[PDB]
Design a protein around this ligand. Structure first.
Ligand SMILES: CC(=O)N[C@@H]1[C@@H](O)[C@H](O)[C@@H](CO)O[C@H]1O
Ligand SMILES: *[C@@H]1O[C@H](CO)[C@@H](O)[C@H](O)[C@H]1NC(C)=O
Ligand SMILES: *[C@@H]1O[C@H](CO)[C@@H](O)[C@H](O)[C@H]1NC(C)=O
Lengths: 265, 48, 49, 49, 208
């Protein structure tokens, strides 16, 4: 069972092809499972103070990878914790901040397999000495009026399971189309279809229903699980519920269509 | 009166895809230096 | 002197007061759960044995 | 032969704390900030570092 | 754990069949110190492990149609004359050379041959339906062609592994030298080198 994400109501006549369009781009799945769980945390600084100054990509780090400092000069100057992914801390350290280092830094984490990303901005204003060095909040970020000529630390720590390597059951995208018929309860609804990112497909009901009740052929290649119900019978009414699950990422989406069928007179 | 023909050959194992050892020939070492210069309480970078 | 006989010394076997130094240094936690990692020198008495 | 007593760590959550010495033998004490205790029930307490 | 051979066994309820092969399996682990199992606390390093997932993208195994197969139950020689009884509801080919390479096809039938010797004629239950992996214990159909391929699952991948942090040594005082009180409970590797013109590389394995 999947928690409520989208609920909808549909109405159609018997003998017509219904389309209960369930889709989730986050259910898109990569055929390559070679350490697909790669995480890249990188720091991007834009020096808005120096007019229109090209932003500098100071440092990259990859879970199961090195902390490559982009420019040879910044080596040593830019530092990120080596256990960053292990503990979730992705803060930066500038060993000796100077006027050249001033600007809005931005840490960005990217998860390839889930095709997910996050990021937060932190400003670094360089003041000559300690008489004007402090920290404050501008409204969307933390700003550090840093001590020129001394180490300054720009904080960001993402305390979430998505950015940690603890075992996650290596789950993959799965989908369950059920149909709570009139008088039936949800989560007991007779299963209509079952799909997995590996292409596993299961159909339910009489073969004619399976022919009429069918999900697209390349569901997970598109993140689509639209359910076609050809030549609707009035018994094909009820609450159709598509439960989309990806336990490795935490996806627990529910997409529901209350398809009530009608007949002529 | 029968006879049997036997043949054998070799190929790299699948795991080689990550266990490969590659031989290299190197020459004409080149060196790059990152300099930081300070003058008149102003800091400048370079890498040459 | 750590890693040698007489690392733990007590005036009597059941003396509440003990004096001993065996080079115990703590380490910063670096795991998700709660856990105190301690690194210590091998007991002196065993090595004398 | 000795035995290293390791009482469970004190945790002060989302605030500050300071080390204190004791009379026990080879007593060693050390604080650590920015820790994130986790346990079978989940996160034990809550403030980012 | 390690050993000297690898053994695979299956019990059929009343009978058990096992097949084994010699192989030198020895426990190995990453790092400059060979421990038993990784500890809870330690550094993170690169290792290579086999994914526990069915999906794979490495390796390429061949497959081709099977060769012929002989059997004794297909022919009976209780009397002087030959007798062939192919399995009921099953096609069979038979061949023998007495006079010529005479061959015949029998569909639930018992065809006969002039020559009488038991060893003479041999029978194939040819089906050539399912492909088979090449192995020394099989035979090749005369075509000798490759028909298909399959993926070998559970293939290698690089991943983070934990390694222990050995007890930090205690440095001493010595004029133009150093004495290190090195303490370690399991085999560890120590290395050092001078920073001058002479490398003076030094490496050693310390046990206790
Ligand atoms: C994540 C946490 O609780 N504390 C860390 C601290 O250990 C680290 O030194 C700092 C950046 O240097 O970022 C923060
Ligand atoms: C550098 O030194 C000169 C010499 O007095 C001074 O006028 C100038 O303000 C200094 N620059 C900075 C950034 O402090
Ligand atoms: C044996 O193969 C021939 C050739 O097609 C076929 O006509 C015959 O029915 C087969 N016999 C059996 C028992 O399948």
């Amino acid at each position: 069972s999947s928690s409520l994400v989208s609920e909808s109501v549909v109405s159609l006549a018997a003998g017509t092809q219904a389309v209960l369009r369930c889709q989730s781009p986050r259910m898109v799945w990569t055929q390559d499972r070679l350490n697909d769980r790669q995480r890249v945390v990188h720091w991007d600084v834009y020096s808005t103070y120096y007019g229109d100054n090209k932003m500098e990509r100071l440092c990259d780090m990859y879970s199961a990878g090195d902390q490559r400092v982009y420019s040879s000069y910044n080596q040593g100057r830019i530092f990120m914790p080596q256990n960053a992914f292990t503990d979730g801390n992705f803060s930066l350290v500038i060993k000796d901040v100077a006027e050249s280092d001033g600007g809005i830094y931005s840490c960005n984490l990217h998860h390839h397999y889930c095709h997910l990303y996050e990021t937060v901005k932190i400003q670094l204003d360089v003041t000559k000495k300690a008489k004007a060095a402090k920290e404050y909040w501008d409204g969307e970020k933390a700003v550090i009026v840093a001590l020129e000529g001394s180490t300054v630390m720009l904080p960001c720590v993402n305390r979430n399971q998505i950015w940690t390597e603890r075992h996650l059951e290596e789950a993959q995208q799965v989908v369950h189309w059920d149909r709570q018929l009139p008088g039936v309860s949800h989560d007991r609804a007779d299963r209509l279809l079952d799909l997995y990112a590996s292409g596993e497909r299961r159909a339910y009901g009489p073969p004619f229903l399976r022919d009429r009740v069918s999900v697209n052929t390349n569901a997970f290649a598109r993140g689509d699980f639209s359910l076609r119900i050809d030549e609707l019978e009035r018994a094909d009414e009820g609450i159709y519920s598509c439960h989309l699950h990806h336990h490795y990422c935490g996806l627990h989406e529910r997409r529901v269509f209350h398809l009530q069928v009608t007949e002529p007179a | 009166e029968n006879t049997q023909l036997s043949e054998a050959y070799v190929e790299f194992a699948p795991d080689c895809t990550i266990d490969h050892a590659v031989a290299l020939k190197v020459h004409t070492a080149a060196l790059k230096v990152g300099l930081r210069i300070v003058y008149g309480n102003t800091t400048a970078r370079l890498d040459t | 002197n750590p890693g040698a006989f007489g690392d733990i010394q007590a005036s009597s076997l059941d003396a509440t007061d003990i004096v001993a130094r065996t080079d115990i240094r703590l380490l910063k936690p670096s795991v998700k759960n709660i856990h105190v990692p301690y690194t210590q020198a091998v007991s002196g008495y065993e090595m004398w044995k | 032969k000795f035995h290293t007593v390791v009482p469970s760590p004190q945790v002060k959550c989302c605030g500050s704390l300071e080390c204190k010495a004791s009379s026990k033998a080879d007593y060693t004490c050390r604080v650590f900030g920015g820790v994130y205790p986790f346990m079978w029930g989940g996160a034990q307490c809550f403030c980012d570092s | 754990p390690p050993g000297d051979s690898v053994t695979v066994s299956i019990t059929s309820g009343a009978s058990e069949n096992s097949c084994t092969v010699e192989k030198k399996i020895r426990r190995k682990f990453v790092g400059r110190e060979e421990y038993l199992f990784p500890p809870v606390h330690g550094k993170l390093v690169k290792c290579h492990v086999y994914d526990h997932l069915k999906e794979t993208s490495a390796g390429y195994i061949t497959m081709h149609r099977p060769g012929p197969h002989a059997y004794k139950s297909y022919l009976e020689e209780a009397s002087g004359e030959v007798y062939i009884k192919p399995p009921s509801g099953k096609n069979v080919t038979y061949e023998c050379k007495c006079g010529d390479y005479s061959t015949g096809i029998v569909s639930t039938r018992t065809k006969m041959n002039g020559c009488t010797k038991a060893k003479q004629c041999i029978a194939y239950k040819r089906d050539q339906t399912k492909w088979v992996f090449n192995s020394p214990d099989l035979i090749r159909h005369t075509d000798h062609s490759v028909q298909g391929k399959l993926h070998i699952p559970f293939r290698l991948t690089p991943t983070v592994c934990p390694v222990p942090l050995a007890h930090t040594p205690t440095v001493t005082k010595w004029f133009k030298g150093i004495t290190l009180h090195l303490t370690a409970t399991r085999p560890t590797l120590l290395t050092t080198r001078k920073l001058g013109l002479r490398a003076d590389a030094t490496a050693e394995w310390i046990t206790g």
